[PDB]
Structures are given as structure tokens and as C-alpha cells.
Amino acid sequence: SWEVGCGAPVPLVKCDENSPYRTITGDCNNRRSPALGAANRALARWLPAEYEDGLALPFGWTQRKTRNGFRVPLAREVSNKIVGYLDEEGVLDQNRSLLFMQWGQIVDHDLDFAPETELGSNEHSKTQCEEYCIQGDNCFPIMFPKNDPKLKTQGKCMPFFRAGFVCPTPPYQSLAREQINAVTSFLDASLVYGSEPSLASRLRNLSSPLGLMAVNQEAWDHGLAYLPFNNKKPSPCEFINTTARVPCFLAGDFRASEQILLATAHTLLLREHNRLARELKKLNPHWNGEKLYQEARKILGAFIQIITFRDYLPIVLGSEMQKWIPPYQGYNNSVDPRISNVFTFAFRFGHMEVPSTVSRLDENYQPWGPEAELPLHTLFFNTWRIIKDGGIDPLVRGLLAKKSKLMNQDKMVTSELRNKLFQPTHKIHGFDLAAINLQRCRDHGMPGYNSWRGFCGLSQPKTLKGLQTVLKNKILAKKLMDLYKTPDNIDIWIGGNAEPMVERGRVGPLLACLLGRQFQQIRDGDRFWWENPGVFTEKQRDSLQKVSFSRLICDNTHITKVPLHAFQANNYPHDFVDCSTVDKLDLSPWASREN
Numbered sequence: 001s002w003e004v005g006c007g008a009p010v011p012l013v014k015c016d017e018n019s020p021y022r023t024i025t026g027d028c029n030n031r032r033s034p035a036l037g038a039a040n041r042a043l044a045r046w047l048p049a050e051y052e053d054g055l056a057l058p059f060g061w062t063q064r065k066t067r068n069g070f071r072v073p074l075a076r077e078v079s080n081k082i083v084g085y086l087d088e089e090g091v092l093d094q095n096r097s098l099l100f101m102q103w104g105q106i107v108d109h110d111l112d113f114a115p116e117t118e119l120g121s122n123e124h125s126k127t128q129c130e131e132y133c134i135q136g137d138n139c140f141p142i143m144f145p146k147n148d149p150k151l152k153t154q155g156k157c158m159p160f161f162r163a164g165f166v167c168p169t170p171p172y173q174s175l176a177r178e179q180i181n182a183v184t185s186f187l188d189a190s191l192v193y194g195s196e197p198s199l200a201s202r203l204r205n206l207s208s209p210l211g212l213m214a215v216n217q218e219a220w221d222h223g224l225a226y227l228p229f230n231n232k233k234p235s236p237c238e239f240i241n242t243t244a245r246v247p248c249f250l251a252g253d254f255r256a257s258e259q260i261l262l263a264t265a266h267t268l269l270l271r272e273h274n275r276l277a278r279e280l281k282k283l284n285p286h287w288n289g290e291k292l293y294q295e296a297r298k299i300l301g302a303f304i305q306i307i308t309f310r311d312y313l314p315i316v317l318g319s320e321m322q323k324w325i326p327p328y329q330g331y332n333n334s335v336d337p338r339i340s341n342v343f344t345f346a347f348r349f350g351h352m353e354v355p356s357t358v359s360r361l362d363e364n365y366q367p368w369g370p371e372a373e374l375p376l377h378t379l380f381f382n383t384w385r386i387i388k389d390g391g392i393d394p395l396v397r398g399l400l401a402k403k404s405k406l407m408n409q410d411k412m413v414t415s416e417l418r419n420k421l422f423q424p425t426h427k428i429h430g431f432d433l434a435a436i437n438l439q440r441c442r443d444h445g446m447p448g449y450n451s452w453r454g455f456c457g458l459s460q461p462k463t464l465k466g467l468q469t470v471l472k473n474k475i476l477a478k479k480l481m482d483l484y485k486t487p488d489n490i491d492i493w494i495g496g497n498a499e500p501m502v503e504r505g506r507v508g509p510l511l512a513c514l515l516g517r518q519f520q521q522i523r524d525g526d527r528f529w530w531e532n533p534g535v536f537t538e539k540q541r542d543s544l545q546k547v548s549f550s551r552l553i554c555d556n557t558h559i560t561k562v563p564l565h566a567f568q569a570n571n572y573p574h575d576f577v578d579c580s581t582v583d584k585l586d587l588s589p590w591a592s593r594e595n
């Protein structure tokens with residue numbers, strides 16, 4: 001039996017098929033298979049799921065059951081031994097701005113989201129997990145190893161809930177557990193507009209026929225818009241400062257307020273949509289709000305597509321860019337547009353690019369007041385520092401003039417993320433992203449490192465000397481072998497990130513292959529790809545080729561000096577030009593005359 005039966009919690013719809021606009025859900029992109037790429041379906045499997053019991057139990061569940069006759073090391077143990085480091089001196093990427101890091105998380109959030117199992121909506125199951133560290137059902141807690149400082153200070157574990165899976169009521173037959181992607185697999189600005197019709201409607205300005213996205217009515221950034229507040233309570237953004245009591249933002253994506261630079265980016269994108277809609281109302285005063293919303297949405301979509309493929313991927317993939325993403329040859333309806341389970345771990349390379357501090361800079365790119373530089377951990381679920389402390393302009397200057405962290409085999413993930421992460425359900429700056437990433441690899445039935453090396457046509461190291469040669473690093477290979485005993489058991493997230501970077505890139509070979517193939521598919525398999533003939537006119541495409549992140553800032557802030565190349569390391573003033581010398585988006589080719 002072959003089964004494409006099971007996928008229950010989804011909006012059902014007849015496909016228009018002649019619409020010039022994407023659906024919100026991602027449905028109807030592929031005409032032969034309308035649900036391919038749509039939200040709230042299984043992540044694609046490039047390799048079959050690997051579970052302790054072949055169905056659903058992750059490796060490390062049953063203390064006793066081995067992986068290939070070896071115990072899997074505790075997620076927190078791998079983190080402590082390998083992923084941690086003390087000295088932030090010298091850690092920064094000398095040719096990547098903070099914008100590099102930040103764009104990664106933006107693209108990631110557009111493509112995939114595997115939300116944790118709910119069921120704990122006013123729940124004692126939450127209690128049995130957080131308080132008593134009791135493994136069972138969806139509680140798969142991260143146990144602290146012996147000697148862990150957090151033993152003395154937090155408890156025996158970090159609580160952890162397993163990712164949502166298709167059929168919370170399956171098809172009754174007997175298959176491996178498959179995690180849901182709650183967002184559209186297409187690069188379509190879903191993190192702005194929503195992947196769900198109901199939310200997408202609530203986000204819109206339906207009071208005026210002007211195709212605008214709803215803006216905050218309680219607060220402004222010197223006349224420029226903020227996202228509306230999420231009024232769902234209790235609010236983690238209120239909790240981190242109950243005096244200020246500034247809630248999280250309401251965005252097309254649940255995660256928009258996770259950290260202040262991500263919230264900033266979401267603000268930049270919402271502003272660009274409203275500016276697009278107003279400029280298109282000027283050109284085409286006969287266009288209704290629906291037409292305005294879709295045409296702006298359609299441009300903003302291509303903008304993300306263009307920045308990602310022209311500016312971002314080449315400086316991630318380096319020498320491997322052309323190998324995996326050759327020049328476009330048009331829409332191929334046989335290409336799987338869906339995001340793979342493994343992709344959602346490969347792209348978490350970004351967690352090694354986040355540095356320990358965030359700066360606010362003034363109009364001369366100097367420290368903005370006495371508390372300019374803040375530790376990252378103070379900025380998780382932090383909206384009050386935007387609303388109540390200078391708006392987004394000072395944070396955007398930091399995005400341009402400050403640097404991403406470089407991935408370092410000895411300095412992988414800053415303590416701000418490894419020890420002081422805040423989760424929106426919980427009350428402590430006490431969680432470990434690197435431990436959560438390793439736990440999540442097991443939750444999702446990820447094959448091992450050598451499985452993936454194999455998939456990518458790379459040598460599979462089986463011995464100490466073998467791993468040393470792949471990693472070009474004797475000590476890291478050793479620490480790995482002592483923890484995992486065989487490279488076969490190395491969880492894909494630490495495995496891929498352990499590899500030294502390709503020439504001119506910021507990931508190693510295994511990650512370049514996994515990311516390369518996914519981005520080749522998200523392009524080739526996308527009927528509404530901006531370069532697909534008929535999606536835009538040839539002239540609209542000439543206009544679009546001129547977009548830049550620098551211009552988005554010029555058009556949606558009060559910053560007047562910006563670099564030409566916003567992703568490379570730029571110092572003020574040598575590398576900054578006045579905004580008037582930056583190419584604009586010419587919207588004249590969107591003019592629509594009935595005569």
C-alpha cells in the first residue's frame with residue numbers, strides 16, 4: 001500500500017488555478033498535486049525516519065536501548081563538552097555584518113516551522129514535565145549530566161515537548177511519525193502575511209480599501225509604523241519586564257518577537273508592504289484593496305527571493321553555490337517544493353553566527369546612550385526596548401555596522417544561547433539552544449551524520465583518524481568519538497556544523513549539499529518564482545533586479561547613510577553612502593491603464 005491519505009488539521013479549498021497570486025496556505029502552487037508545499041503537512045523525508053522502535057520513540061528515550069550498540073550521549077553533555085566556550089574575544093566574522101545572521105533566521109522562518117505539541121493549554125502535563133522531569137507522551141525532557149552547574153541552580157532537566165506530527169488521530173494503518181511544517185515551503189513572505197487564512201485576514205487593514213497591513217495604534221516610531229500587539233495572555237514579552245508591560249508583536253509568524261533584531265526585521269518588512277501599497281494606489285487609483293494587498297504581497301515575495309538567491313546564498317554556499325544552484329532554467333512541476341525534515345536542522349548553522357551582544361548606534365554610528373551594548377539574553381521576547389527605548393533605527397544601525405559571530409570549531413554557540421535562552425512558555429533565562437537542537441534531531445527521527453554524508457556522496461568516517469581527517473581537527477574528532485563512540489551516531493546538527501567551511505562560504509561540505517539541494521528545489525519547484533515567465537512582466541523583472549536591503553532601510557527608516565553591500569562587514573563612515581545614491585525600485589512598470 002502507498003498512502004497519501006493522512007493530513008487532518010488543514011484548511012480545505014477548491015483551487016482557482018488561473019489566479020496570478022499565491023494562496024496564503026501555499027495550496028494550488030503545483031496544479032497536478034495542489035497540497036505539495038502547502039502549510040500544515042508532513043515535512044518531506046529525503047531519507048526514512050530513524051526511531052529507537054522504528055515508529056515514534058526517539059533515540060535516547062529508553063535508557064538501555066542502544067544506537068548501533070552504543071548509548072547516545074545526553075544532549076546537554078555534547079553541548080557542555082563541545083559547543084560551549086568562555087572567550088568572546090576574536091570570535092566575530094570579519095567579513096559578515098549582523099544582517100547576515102539576521103537574514104538567515106528571516107529566510108528560515110519563511111520556509112519551515114515544526115511547532116511543539118500543544119495539549120498543554122492550561123495543563124498539569126506541563127507541570128509533570130517542568131517540575132518532575134517525568135519522560136512520557138510528549139514530555140522528552142533534557143536531563144542534566146553530572147557536574148552540570150544547572151543541577152545546582154535550575155533542577156534535574158530542561159523541559160522539552162516533542163514536535164507536532166501528522167494525524168493527531170492517524171490513518172489507523174502503521175507508519176513512522178512525520179512532523180508537520182506549519183508554514184508554506186515556498187519563499188513567499190509567509191512570515192509577514194501568515195500561512196493560515198484566518199490570521200492573514202486579521203493581520204490586514206480591512207477598514208480602508210487600500211490593501212494595507214494593520215499597524216499599531218498605541219505606539220509609533222517617530223511617525224513610522226510598529227506591528228500591532230499580540231493581545232493573547234499570558235505574554236512572555238510582558239513577563240521579561242512587568243513594569244514596562246509591552247506585549248509581543250502580532251506577525252504572520254508566531255516567532256516574530258523571539259529576539260529584538262528578528263522583531264526589527266519583521267517591522268522593516270511590514271513597513272515595505274504598506275509603502276508598496278500606497279505607491280501602487282498612487283499609480284493605479286482604480287485598484288481595490290484586494291488587488292493592492294496581493295500586488296504588494298507579490299512584490300515583497302520576489303524581494304525576499306532576490307535578496308536570498310543573489311546576496312545571501314552565495315556567501316553561505318561559497319564555492320558550492322554553482323554546483324547546487326546553477327542558472328535558472330524555468331519552473332519544473334516535477335521538483336518537490338516541500339521543505340525536508342533534515343533541512344530544518346541544516347539551516348540551524350545560524351545558531352553559531354549569533355554573537356553575545358546587540359548594540360544600538362546613533363546617527364553617526366556611535367554608541368546610543370549609556371546602555372548601547374546589551375547581552376543577547378536580555379533581548380529574547382523583548383519588545384519594550386523598541387517601543388520604550390529608541391525604536392528600530394538604532395538596532396538597524398547595529399545590523400549594518402556590527403558583525404555576525406564566525407563559526408569556530410573551539411567556539412560554536414555563545415553562552416547567551418547555550419545557557420540563558422528564554423522560552424515563551426517558561427519563566428527563566430536558563431535554556432540551551434544547542435541541547436534543544438540535539439534533542440530535536442532525535443525527536444524528528446534524524447538519521448546520523450554518516451547516513452547524511454552518504455546521501456551527499458561524501459566519505460563516511462568510521463574511526464578516530466577518519467573523523468580527524470574530515471574535521472581537520474584532532475581534539476574535536478576525539479571529544480566526538482568519546483561521546484558518540486561511532487561517527488554513525490553523531491546527531492546531524494553537531495555533525496554538519498563540526499565540518500570546516502567550504503571556500504568563500506560559511507558552512508562545510510555536508511551542510512552545503514543539504515542546503516544547496518533544498519534552495520535549488522524551493523526555486524525550481526515554485527510556479528510563482530519571480531523569474532518564472534508570466535509571473536512578472538520582463539520590465540517588472542528589470543525593475544526588481546535593482547532591489548537591495550540597503551534601499552529597504554532607506555525607504556522604511558530615518559537612516560540616511562547605508563552601505564551598498566549590506567551583508568559584508570562595513571565600517572562607518574568609509575563604507576557608507578548617502579541613501580540618494582542607492583538604486584530605487586521603479587514601480588512605473590506596475591501602472592495599469594484600461595485605455
Ligand code: HEM
Pocket residue numbers: 101102103104105108109112113114258259343344345347348349350351353354376433436437440
Ligand atoms: C538570537 C538568534 C536566534 C535565536 C534566539 C534562535 C532561537 C531558536 C529557537 C528557540 C528555535 C526552536 C528550537 C526547537 O524547539 O527545536 C530555533 C529554531 C531554528 N532556528 Fe534559530 N534562533 C536564532 C537564530 C537563527 C538563525 C540566524 C538561523 C539561521 C540562519 C536560525 C535557524 C533556525 C532554524 C532552521 C530553526 C528550526 C526551525 C525554526 O526556526 O523554528 N536561527 N531557533
Ligand SMILES: *[C@@H]1O[C@H](CO)[C@@H](O[C@@H]2O[C@H](CO)[C@@H](O)[C@H](O)[C@H]2NC(C)=O)[C@H](O)[C@H]1NC(C)=O
Pocket residue numbers: 205207208210212213214215216217
Ligand atoms: C487602516 O487605514 C486607515 C486609512 O489609511 C488608517 O487611518 C489613518 O491613520 C493615520 C495614522 O493613525 C491618520 O493620521 C489618518 O488620518 C487616518 N485616517 C482615518 C480615515 O482615520 C488606519 O489607522 C488603518 N488601521 C489600522 C488598524 O492600521
Ligand SMILES: *[C@@H]1O[C@H](CO)[C@@H](O)[C@H](O)[C@H]1NC(C)=O
Pocket residue numbers: 095315568569
Ligand atoms: C567579503 O565577502 C564578499 C563576498 O562576496 C566579497 O565580495 C568581498 O570582497 C569580501 N571582502 C573582504 C574579505 O574583505
Ligand SMILES: *[C@@H]1O[C@H](CO)[C@@H](O)[C@H](O)[C@H]1NC(C)=O
Pocket residue numbers: 240241243244384388
Ligand atoms: C523595564 O522598563 C523600564 C521602562 O519601562 C526601565 O526603566 C527598567 O529598567 C526596565 N526593567 C527591566 C527589568 O528590564
Ligand SMILES: *[C@@H]1O[C@H](CO)[C@@H](O)[C@H](O)[C@H]1NC(C)=O
Pocket residue numbers: 332334335
Ligand atoms: C525536472 O525535474 C525532474 C525530477 O528532478 C528531472 O528528472 C527532469 O529531468 C527535470 N526536467 C527538466 C525539463 O529539467
Ligand SMILES: [Ca+2]
Pocket residue numbers: 110111183184185186187188189190191
Ligand atoms: Ca513560506
Ligand SMILES: [K+]
Pocket residue numbers: 044045046047340341342343
Ligand atoms: K529528511
Ligand SMILES: [K+]
Pocket residue numbers: 105109255
Ligand atoms: K526560529
Ligand SMILES: [Zn+2]
Pocket residue numbers: 221222558
Ligand atoms: Zn525619525
